[PDB]
Scaffold this active site. Sequence first.
Site, short mmCIF file in Angstrom:
data_model
loop_
_atom_site.label_atom_id
_atom_site.label_comp_id
_atom_site.label_asym_id
_atom_site.label_seq_id
_atom_site.Cartn_x
_atom_site.Cartn_y
_atom_site.Cartn_z
N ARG A 32 86.93 12.04 65.18
CA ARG A 32 86.44 13.12 64.19
C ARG A 32 87.52 12.77 62.97
O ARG A 32 88.58 12.59 62.82
CB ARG A 32 87.03 14.40 64.73
N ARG A 39 89.35 32.00 48.95
CA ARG A 39 91.00 31.81 48.78
C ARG A 39 91.20 32.80 47.68
O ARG A 39 90.48 33.18 46.94
CB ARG A 39 91.19 30.49 48.15
#
Lengths: 492, 492, 492, 492
Positions: free
Chosen positions: C49, C90
Site C-alpha cells: 500500500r 480542516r
Amino acid sequence: SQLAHNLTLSIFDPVANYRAARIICTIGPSTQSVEALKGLIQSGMSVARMNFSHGSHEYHQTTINNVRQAAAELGVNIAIALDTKGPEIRTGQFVGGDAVMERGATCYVTTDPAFADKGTKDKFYIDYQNLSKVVRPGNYIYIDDGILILQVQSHEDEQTLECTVTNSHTISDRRGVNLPGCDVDLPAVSAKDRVDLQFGVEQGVDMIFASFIRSAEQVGDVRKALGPKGRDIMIICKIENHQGVQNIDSIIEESDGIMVARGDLGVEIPAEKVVVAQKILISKCNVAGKPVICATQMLESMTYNPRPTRAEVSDVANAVFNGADCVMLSGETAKGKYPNEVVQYMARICLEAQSALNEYVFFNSIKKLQHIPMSADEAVCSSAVNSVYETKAKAMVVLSNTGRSARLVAKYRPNCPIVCVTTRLQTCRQLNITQGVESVFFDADKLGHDEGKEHRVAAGVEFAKSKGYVQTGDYCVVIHAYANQTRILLVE
Amino acid sequence: SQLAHNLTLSIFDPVANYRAARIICTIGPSTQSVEALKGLIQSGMSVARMNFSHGSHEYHQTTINNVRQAAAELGVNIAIALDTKGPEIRTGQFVGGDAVMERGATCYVTTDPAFADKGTKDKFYIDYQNLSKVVRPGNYIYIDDGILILQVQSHEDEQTLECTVTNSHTISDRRGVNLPGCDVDLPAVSAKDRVDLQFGVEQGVDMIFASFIRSAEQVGDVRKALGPKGRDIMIICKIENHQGVQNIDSIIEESDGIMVARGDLGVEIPAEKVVVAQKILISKCNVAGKPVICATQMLESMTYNPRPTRAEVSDVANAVFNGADCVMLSGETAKGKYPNEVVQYMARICLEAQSALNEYVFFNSIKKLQHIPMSADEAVCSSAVNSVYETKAKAMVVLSNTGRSARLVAKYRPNCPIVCVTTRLQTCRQLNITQGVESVFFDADKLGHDEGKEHRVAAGVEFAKSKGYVQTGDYCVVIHAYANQTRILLVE
Amino acid sequence: SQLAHNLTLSIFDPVANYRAARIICTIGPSTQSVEALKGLIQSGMSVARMNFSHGSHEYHQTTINNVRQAAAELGVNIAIALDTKGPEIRTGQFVGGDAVMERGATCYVTTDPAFADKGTKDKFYIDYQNLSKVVRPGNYIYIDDGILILQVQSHEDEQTLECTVTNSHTISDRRGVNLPGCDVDLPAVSAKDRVDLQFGVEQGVDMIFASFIRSAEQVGDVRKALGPKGRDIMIICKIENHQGVQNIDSIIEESDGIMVARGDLGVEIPAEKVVVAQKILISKCNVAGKPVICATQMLESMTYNPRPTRAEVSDVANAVFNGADCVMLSGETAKGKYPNEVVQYMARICLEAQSALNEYVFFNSIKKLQHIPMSADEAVCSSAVNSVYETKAKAMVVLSNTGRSARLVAKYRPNCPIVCVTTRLQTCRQLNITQGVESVFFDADKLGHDEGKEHRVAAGVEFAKSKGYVQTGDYCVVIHAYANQTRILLVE
Amino acid sequence: SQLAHNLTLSIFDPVANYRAARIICTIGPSTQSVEALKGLIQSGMSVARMNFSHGSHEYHQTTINNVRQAAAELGVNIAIALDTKGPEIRTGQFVGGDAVMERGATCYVTTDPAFADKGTKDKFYIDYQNLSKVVRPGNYIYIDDGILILQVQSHEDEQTLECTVTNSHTISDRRGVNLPGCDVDLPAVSAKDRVDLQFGVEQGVDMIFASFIRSAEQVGDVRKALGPKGRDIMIICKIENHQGVQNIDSIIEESDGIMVARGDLGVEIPAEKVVVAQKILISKCNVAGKPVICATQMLESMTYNPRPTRAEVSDVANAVFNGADCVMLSGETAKGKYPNEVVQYMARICLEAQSALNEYVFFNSIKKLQHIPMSADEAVCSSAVNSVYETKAKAMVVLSNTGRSARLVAKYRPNCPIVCVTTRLQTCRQLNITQGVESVFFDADKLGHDEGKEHRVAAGVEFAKSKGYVQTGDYCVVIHAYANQTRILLVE
Ligand SMILES: O=S(=O)(O)c1cc(S(=O)(=O)O)c2ccc3c(S(=O)(=O)O)cc(S(=O)(=O)O)c4ccc1c2c43
Ligand SMILES: O=S(=O)(O)c1cc(S(=O)(=O)O)c2ccc3c(S(=O)(=O)O)cc(S(=O)(=O)O)c4ccc1c2c43
C-alpha cells in the site's frame, strides 16, 4: 422422507398396536338390525352413514334408534351421519319407457315441461331449467352415469338444444345427467333436503354429508337450513365435480370437512385425474386440520364376492398413504353379502398401511407450512407433537370440550395414539371422523368441573393403560386449556 | 446464519430493551465502601468478586457486609464470589533481594529448603518439591509472569537442575514460576484455601472461583473443602493452563461453571491460541448449560485512562459473540480511577453486541446436538424456547427454586428476557452468572406456598410488565413443575 | 454451526497447510528499500500500500520500482495499491499557532476565507464552505481526531456559527474536522487526487483504495478520474463515516471491494458500534463476492514494542472470523521498528484463526441466500465448491483470465486452497486481495492459447503438488469456461 | 414435501411435455405381427417382453424378427426381454384327469415317481423331490394358483406326507404348487431355462427377466447360464415369494434390476402386505440406482373390456408415485382385445401421475442417503441434477456408452428430460427400462470418434430442440467423461 422410511421396513414385522384411520359404514337391509350393527361396530365401524337418497324418515329412524341401541349395549360412542340426496339434474320420461340413442343421430333436449311425460329418442325433457343459458355449442351432455354422451351443436330455440349422439346407448326414464364443462347453478339444498336436514336436527345427528357442494356460499346455505338448533352439527362437503375441485380452498375454509366422492367425480373427470384430485383434496384438508373422507368404490367387489380385488386393496392402502382420516363403504355394508368381513378387511388394510406410513413426514411438512408468528393454539399443539417425537412418548392426552384441540393435535400426526378426554358425548361421536384419536367421556355434571384437570388427565392416562399404549416409566404428553398448556408426564 | 443476520442490521437502529450478559466486578480499596458499591450496582454490577490472593478475613468480611448493605438499600440481590489464592509455585529469597539473570549464563534451581533465604543468580530456591521429577531436559521454566525463561539442561542432583538463562531479566524475591510443558501435581487447594473456603461457607458466599483447576478430581477436593454445609455453593473452575484446557470436558462435567483466565493461559500458550481456547471453552459450556466467564485483561487500560483502546472494546464484544454468560473486571474496579465508568461502558458494549447477536443460531445449534430420545426437562425447556420464536413471545417466566430450570431455559437462548420466579434468595444471587435471566423473589413464608403457582406466575408477569418487556396482548411463555409444564399466556 | 465446530477443536492440533487471509502492508522509511520489501514479502505481504496522504510522486515511484524489483527477484507477484489522500475538512491557522479551548466557553467557526490566517480561540476558519447549510443547531463539530468537541448553538450569520466548547482541548493549525450527524457533500475526489490517480494509471497500479466514499455516485466519479486507460484498475472504497455505512449496499454494488477503516469510523461513531459495522460490512461483501479489507489499528502497539497486546491479537483473529479477505498494517510497517516480525505475527494469527474457522458455515449461509433460478456462473461455482466438500477434494483449480471466476469460487469458501491459473499477470496481482486463492501465470503468447485447457489445468495441478496440497490419489475440482464447466480430477 | 407439492396442483393444468415412466408389453398372438407391433410402439411400448413359459423357439424368433422390423420402420430402438419359464413345482396326473378335494378329508402327497401317472384324491404326486425335508407339520401346501390349500399333519414316510384338505376345490392335471412357509431349494434355472438363455444370447436379447429369484447366489447361476457371450445382457430378478423379499438387499446388489411380481407374491403373502412390499422394493431400487418394474395385474380387466376399473387406474398411478421406472402389461397386450388402447391409456395415467409427482423429493431423499465422502461419479451426477433445479434447466444431455452414467443421473430424478447420447445401439435399447431417459444413437463408424465430444453434445442438444424440450436461451446441463465432467450450456 417416506422413501427413506420404506428402506427400513419389513412386511414380517408386527403391525402397530392401534389403527389411526376411521371406517364409515352405510347402513341398509344387510345391516340395519341391532345385531348386524353390533357386528359392524365389533368389526371396526366408527360412523354409521344414512343415505337419504333412498328410504323414508321412518326407515332412517330405525337406523338411528338401532345404532344408538347397538352402541349403548357395547358401551361405545358411534357417530351418525346424514348423507343428503341433494340437487339433481334428471331426464324426463320416455314413450315406452325407453329410448335407443345411436351414434351419428341428431336429437333435441328441451327444458319445456310439456315434454316431461312424452320423451322420445328425437326429443326429450331435462329438468334443469337453466340448461340452455349455461351450455355453449361444443359442450357435452352426459346421461345415465356418463355412459351416454351428447354434444351440443346449437340452440334450436330458447328452451331446446340440437345435439349429436356421440355414442350408442339405450336410456330409460328419469336418468341422471351431468354437465362436465359447465357450472351448474342449482341451489345448495333441494326441497327434500330441507325436510331431511330438519329431521336430522330433531333426531340429533352428528354430521351432514352435504351432496354436490360447488362453492363456498353453498356451505352457508346448508348451515342456514340446519337452523340455530343445528349449529354444532358438522358439515362435511361432498366434492363431486370440477366446481367443487376448483373452489376447494374456499369450500374447505367454510366446511367442517370434505368427502372425496371418487365415483361421482369420475362421471365427469377422467379416472387418472380423479386419483390426483384425491391427493390434492386430502393434503389440503390435512393442512387445514379438517377431517377428509375417501369414499365410493373402495372394496366394491366384496359386495358379493368373499374377497376384493388386489387393485381394490391397493386403493384402500393408498387412501391412507395420501393422508385420509376416513375410508367409506357404501353398498358393501348397505346391501352386501359380507358386511362384517368387508369392514374387518378394511381395518386390516388400514392398519398395514399405517405401519408403513412415516407419520413424521406429515408432521414436518405441515409444521414447515405454518406462518410465523403462530397463534398460541397452533404453537402449543405442534410443540406437543414435537415433544412426542423428541421424548418418544407413547401416548397423548388432550382435554377438549368441543373437539377443536383434539383435531388440532391430530393434524400434526404424532406417531402414538391420541386420547381425547371430553365433557361432551357429541364430541366423542364427532371425533370418530378424525384419525388417530379415541375419546373418553367425562361427565362433569356427575363428577365435577375438575378445575385442576387432575381427574380428566387420570381418566386419559388410565384409558391409555387399559389399551396397552403406555406402562410404568413411559412418557405421556398432556395438553389442555382452547389448548395453551402442555405437560410431559411420567406414567406411574 | 449469523452471516444472514449481519446483512439485516443497522447500527442506527435502537439497542435491545434488556442486557443479557452479566458483569462481575472485583472489589478493592477503590470500591469497598457502601456508596462505591451502590455506584457499581447502578452502573451494571451483578456479582461482587473478592480476590482472596490479597487482604485479611476481616477485610473480606467488610466487603461482604458492605455488598449486602448496598444491595439492600437498592432493593436488589447481588452475588458474592470468593476467588481463591490457590496453590502457587514461587522462587525463594535472594541475597540483596535481587538477581540479575543474563542470556547464555548457567544457573542452578534447587528444591533444597536451605537455599530458601540465600538465593543468588547462580543458585536459588523454588518451593515446588516435585520440580525435578516433573521436569525433563529441554523443558522451560518461566519466572516472574513468564518474563524470565530458563531451559532445563540436566539433573545436577536429586534436588537441583542445571539451567540455561534464555533471556536477560532481573528478578526479585518470591516470584511466581510456571511450568508450560509440565503437569503440575500440586494439591487442588492450599492450606490457606481450605481455611478461606470454610470462612466462605460460614459467611454464606454464593460461589467459589477456584484457582488453577487442572483436573476433574481437583473439583472434588474443592467440594470436600467446602464440606456438608457448603453443598449449595457453586464451584466455578478457573482454567489457567494447558492441563485445564486438555482436561476441559471432565472438568466441566464436575463443576458448576468455568472461568476462562486469558492472562494466565497466555503465560504458557501463544495469545492467538488462547483466543481459540476461549472459543472452545465458551461453546463447551454453552452446550453443557453451565455459566462461563470471560476474565482478565478485559478493559485493562481503563484502570487509569478515561477510555479503553478500540481493540479492548472489540475483545469485550467478541466475548459476548463467543457466547459468554459473564464478562469480568479485575483491577479496573478493584484499584481503578474510573470504576463506575468502566462498568457502564462494559454494559454498553455488551448491549450493543447483543443487539447484533443472532440468538436463534445458538438455540438451533444446541438443539441439534441433543440426543434423541430427550429427557422430559430437556424437551420441555427447548420446546418452550422454540415456542418463543414461533409466537414471537416477548418474555419467559420460569418457576425455579434451585435455579436449575432457569439455567436450562437460558441454555437454549430465547430472544427475549427470562424472568425466574424463585422462593430462595440464594437462587436470585446465583442466577447472576447466567445470561438473560432476571430473578424475582417470592417470599413463601410471608405470602404462602402458592401450590397452584398462580401467585408466582403473576409476580413474574408483573415484573415483566414493569420493565416494559410485555404489554397487553403480548405472548409470555411460562414454565414450571424439575420443569415439565408449559403455558403460552396472553398478557392482560 | 461454528459452535458445533468449536466443540471438536484442540489448540494443540496442527494448523492448516495454507493461509487463506491476505496481508496488506503500508510502505514507508522502515520498508521502502528492495531488501526491506524482500523481507516483507518473505514475511507474508501480498499487497504493498502507498499512502498518498504523504510523500511526493518521486517518493512513490521509488516504492513502485522497488516493489517490482523485490517481487521479480523472489519470483512472485505483488499487488500495488494507491491509497488516496481524498477530500478533507480542516481548520485554518491560528495566531501563535495555537488555540486553548475551554469547557463552557463560546467560540465562532466561520467559512469566511479572511480568517484562514488569523484564527483565535474566539473565532477561527473551517475550509468546508457548505458547513453552515449542512449543520443544524444541536449538531456537534469534532476537531483534531475527534478530541475537541463543539456543539452548534445558532447561525451567527450566513458564514458563521456560534458554538459551545463541550470539553477542554488545545488545538494547533490545520486540524481535521468531522461532522458526525451531517451529510458531508464534498466531491468524490480532490484536485490532488486527480493528479495522483492519473499518475497511478501511468505507473500501472493494480487498485485504488479510495478515501471517504459516502455514496454510490462517487464510485463512478473515481472511475471517471481514472480514465479509459484505467478501466481494469480495481476501486476499493474506504468506508469512513455514517454515510458510507448507510449507503453500503449501493456502494458495494458499484465498487470492486471495501475497506473497513475502523479508526476513521471511530472518530464519529462509538467504538462498540464500529465493531458491529465491521461485522455487517464484511458479511455484505462476502455475499456480494467482493474482497473486504479490515484496516487501521490492527497491531498498532507493535510499531515500537516487540510484541502486541493480547486484545490486538484477538482483534486480528476476529477480523478473520468475521470473514475478512485481508488484514492491513499501516504505521507498523511504514514507520515501525519491527516490520518483518509484525507481518510474521499477523500471518501466524490469521493461520491460527483459520484453523478454527468452519468454512462450511460460510459456504452454506451464502448458498442459502442465492435466488433461484441462479445464473450458470453462480450454479457452476457453488456446485464446484459443494463437490469439494462432498468428495473431500484437497484443491481447486480455476482457470480465469480476468479473475472473475476465481473470486466467484472464493466467495463460496471451499475448505481447500484455490489455485487460479490465469493468462494475465495483473490478474495474479489483483487476486492478492482475495482470500484463499493463489495464482499461476500462464503466458499464452509464449506457450499457446491452450484451447483444450489441458496445459493450464496441468499448470494448476502441478503448483498444487509442489505446495503439498494434493498427492497421487487425491481429488481436485477444476473449473473453467466466465466459468460454466467443471471436472472432478483424480490426481496422478 | 409431496404434501406441500400437492397443495399447488390443479388437474386443469396441462400435463408435462414428456413421459418419464416406461411401458413394457408382453407379445402374443394378438400382437406378434409387424403392424400390431408398430401400433404398440406408437401407443407407448418401449420394451417387448417374450414370455418363455409358452411358445417354441421358432415362435419367439418371429417375435424377435418382427420387433426389429417394426422398430426399424418407425426409426426407433425397442428393447427385447426374455422372461424365463423358471423352475416349477407341479402336481402329477390324476385318474380321470380330475380330483375332487373336500374340506376335512385326509389326503397323501408323495414324491415317489410311480404315482406321477396314477394320482387320486387320496394320494397323488408332487414333482419336488425335496418336499418332505423342507416341510414341517403345520405348514401349508398351496395348489392351483393357491386356491386349494392343504395342511401338513405328519410324515407318513420318507416320501409321503399326510395332509388335511382345509377347503373344497377340484384340481386337474399338472397344477402348480406353492410352499408359503418354506424355503424352496430348486436350482436357480431349469434345463429349459439354460437352453432358453443360450438361445437368448445367440439372438441378442437385451435383458433377461429371471423368474422366481429367491437368493443372491441364484443371480450368479443365471449369469453363468448366459455365459461369456451374454455378459452385457441385463439380469432383472423377478421377486415372486417371501424368500426374494427377505433376501432383497443381496439380490439387488447382484442383479441389474428388479421386477415386483404382485400376483405371484400374493399367492402366499396377504394383498395388503404385497402393496407395502412393492413400496419397499421400489424405494430400495431407486436408492440402488437400478431399474424397477411394477408387473402383473396392472390393467387386467382391459384384456376384454374397453375400459379398466377405477381401482386399476389408481394402481398404475401409485406405481409411478412409488417410484417405479416401468409398468408392465401381460395378457392385456399378449391376447387382449384392446392392445393399442390399453398401452395408450397406461401412457396417459403415467403422464398424469408424473405431473403430480414431486421429483425434488426423490432427488433430496436419495442425495441425503449418500455416504460422505462420495466418489467422483456419484458427486458429478448428483451435482448435475442439483444444477438443473438451481438453474431451472429444461434438459440434460448425458454422454454414456454403456448406459451406466445415464442410469446414475436418472437415479437422482431431475425434473426435466434426460437425453443420453450413446455410440452403442444396445445401450439405446437397454435404457428403455430407465425412467426419464431418451437415447440418441451416434454412429461412430459413420461419423467419427468425436474425441472433443462436440458432435455428440450437439446431437443431444438438437434432439432436445426437436422434441420442444429446450429453445433459444434455455439452460441445458451436459455431463460426460465414467462421467466426471459437467457443463451448464446456454441453448443457442
Ligand atoms: O322454494 S321453497 O321450497 O318454497 C323454500 C322454502 C323455504 S322454508 O320456508 O324455510 O322451508 C326456504 C327457506 C330458506 C331459503 C333460503 S335461505 O337459506 O333461508 O336464505 C334460500 C333459498 S334460495 O333458493 O337460495 O333462494 C330458498 C329457496 C326456497 C325455499 C327456501 C329458501
Ligand atoms: O475543479 S477543477 O480542479 O478545475 C477540475 C478539473 C478537471 S480535469 O480538467 O479533468 O482535470 C475535472 C475533470 C472532471 C470533473 C468531473 S467529471 O468526473 O469528469 O464529470 C466532475 C467534477 S465536479 O467537482 O463533481 O463538478 C469536476 C470538478 C473539478 C474538476 C474536474 C471535474
